[PDB]
Design an enzyme around this catalytic site. Structure first.
Site, PDB file in Angstrom:
ATOM      1  N   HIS A  45       0.791  -1.226   0.000  1.00 58.83           N
ATOM      2  CA  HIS A  45       0.000   0.000   0.000  1.00 58.83           C
ATOM      3  C   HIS A  45       0.830   1.285   0.000  1.00 58.83           C
ATOM      4  O   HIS A  45       0.344   2.343  -0.392  1.00 58.83           O
ATOM      5  CB  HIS A  45      -1.026  -0.007   1.151  1.00 58.83           C
ATOM      6  CG  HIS A  45      -0.493   0.455   2.487  1.00 58.83           C
ATOM      7  ND1 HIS A  45      -0.162  -0.411   3.489  1.00 58.83           N
ATOM      8  CD2 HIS A  45      -0.314   1.709   2.966  1.00 58.83           C
ATOM      9  CE1 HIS A  45       0.207   0.289   4.566  1.00 58.83           C
ATOM     10  NE2 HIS A  45       0.120   1.563   4.271  1.00 58.83           N
ATOM     11  N   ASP A  93       0.025  -7.486   1.817  1.00 62.33           N
ATOM     12  CA  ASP A  93       0.531  -6.118   1.866  1.00 62.33           C
ATOM     13  C   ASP A  93       2.055  -6.134   1.962  1.00 62.33           C
ATOM     14  O   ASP A  93       2.645  -5.897   3.022  1.00 62.33           O
ATOM     15  CB  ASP A  93      -0.073  -5.374   3.061  1.00 62.33           C
ATOM     16  CG  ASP A  93       0.078  -3.870   2.941  1.00 62.33           C
ATOM     17  OD1 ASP A  93       0.610  -3.411   1.908  1.00 62.33           O
ATOM     18  OD2 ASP A  93      -0.343  -3.150   3.872  1.00 62.33           O
ATOM     19  N   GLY A 186       2.646   6.446   8.636  1.00 63.98           N
ATOM     20  CA  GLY A 186       4.026   6.814   8.384  1.00 63.98           C
ATOM     21  C   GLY A 186       4.963   5.690   8.788  1.00 63.98           C
ATOM     22  O   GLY A 186       6.127   5.676   8.382  1.00 63.98           O
ATOM     23  N   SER A 188       3.990   2.441   8.305  1.00 63.99           N
ATOM     24  CA  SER A 188       3.701   1.365   7.357  1.00 63.99           C
ATOM     25  C   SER A 188       4.912   1.013   6.516  1.00 63.99           C
ATOM     26  O   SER A 188       5.701   1.887   6.142  1.00 63.99           O
ATOM     27  CB  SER A 188       2.567   1.766   6.410  1.00 63.99           C
ATOM     28  OG  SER A 188       1.337   1.881   7.094  1.00 63.99           O
ATOM     29  N   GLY A 189       5.038  -0.272   6.205  1.00 58.00           N
ATOM     30  CA  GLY A 189       6.147  -0.731   5.387  1.00 58.00           C
ATOM     31  C   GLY A 189       7.391  -1.035   6.194  1.00 58.00           C
ATOM     32  O   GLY A 189       8.260  -1.784   5.740  1.00 58.00           O
TER      33      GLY A 189
END
Length: 240
Positions: A45, A93, A186, A188-189
């Site tokens: 995402h 994801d 912020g 995420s990932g």
């Protein structure tokens, strides 16, 4: 990261800042984990947008010169083929970014160690989420890299009705939920570092939090379970 503390600048050398070009500058948008000198693992995402992304390794302070940063562009993006942006609850994801060049490794830049395929952590396992995400729900990004102790919440508990229900899948890892500490926008990932057999390994890729808030009790931060994608990661790197 809500309820975090400032990470020492050399504690999580595999953490990277994924940024996008916003005019005459760049803005941090997600975290990521350096897994190869030229490959970064992040959330699918985080790259749904048709933007110009770059990765910063050796990053600690997004607003100051740390004197250890290496800036490199993203040459290719490989999102998991089953990813569906309008259905993050379905999972998948995760995405791999091939960097335009190989970064140099040092005490501030190292490859993140991934868990053995199929590894599932016992409930309440010790982990730390790291990132520059919001420090409060509806807040602002952190300037210095933050870390928060988020013990895991196993599938049985995390998928129970008072938690995430069927929203969480076995292909995910849940951590935290004490209502004080959590990942936030912020983050995420980024990685979820868990201590196993004396060594930290990246067991998760930050995926989502509740729509009602970041640090909401019984709504632990949800991560893509890295150990469920080892073959996928290997296949992609072997291809590109």
């Amino acid at each position: 990261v809500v309820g975090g503390t400032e990470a020492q600048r050399n504690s999580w050398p595999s953490q990277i800042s994924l940024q996008y070009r916003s005019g005459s500058s760049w803005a941090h948008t997600c975290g990521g984990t350096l897994i190869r000198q030229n490959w970064v693992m992040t959330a699918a995402h985080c790259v749904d947008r048709e933007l110009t992304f770059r990765v910063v390794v050796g990053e600690h302070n997004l607003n100051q010169n740390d004197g250890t940063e290496q800036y490199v562009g993203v040459q290719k993006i490989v999102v998991h083929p089953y990813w569906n942006t309008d259905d993050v609850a379905a999972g998948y994801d995760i995405a791999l970014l091939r960097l335009a060049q190989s970064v140099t490794l040092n005490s501030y830049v190292q490859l993140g160690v991934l868990p053995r395929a199929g590894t599932i952590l016992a409930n309440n396992s010790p982990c730390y989420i790291t990132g520059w995400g919001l420090t409060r729900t509806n807040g602002q990004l952190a300037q210095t890299l933050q870390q928060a102790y988020l013990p895991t919440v196993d599938y049985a508990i995390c998928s129970s009705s008072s938690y995430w229900g069927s929203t969480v899948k076995n292909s995910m890892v849940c951590a935290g939920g004490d209502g004080v500490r959590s990942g936030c926008q912020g983050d995420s990932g980024g990685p979820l570092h868990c201590l196993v057999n004396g060594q930290y390994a990246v067991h998760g890729v930050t995926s989502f939090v509740s729509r009602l808030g970041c640090n909401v009790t019984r709504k632990p931060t949800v991560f893509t379970r890295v150990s469920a994608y080892i073959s996928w990661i290997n296949n992609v790197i072997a291809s590109n």
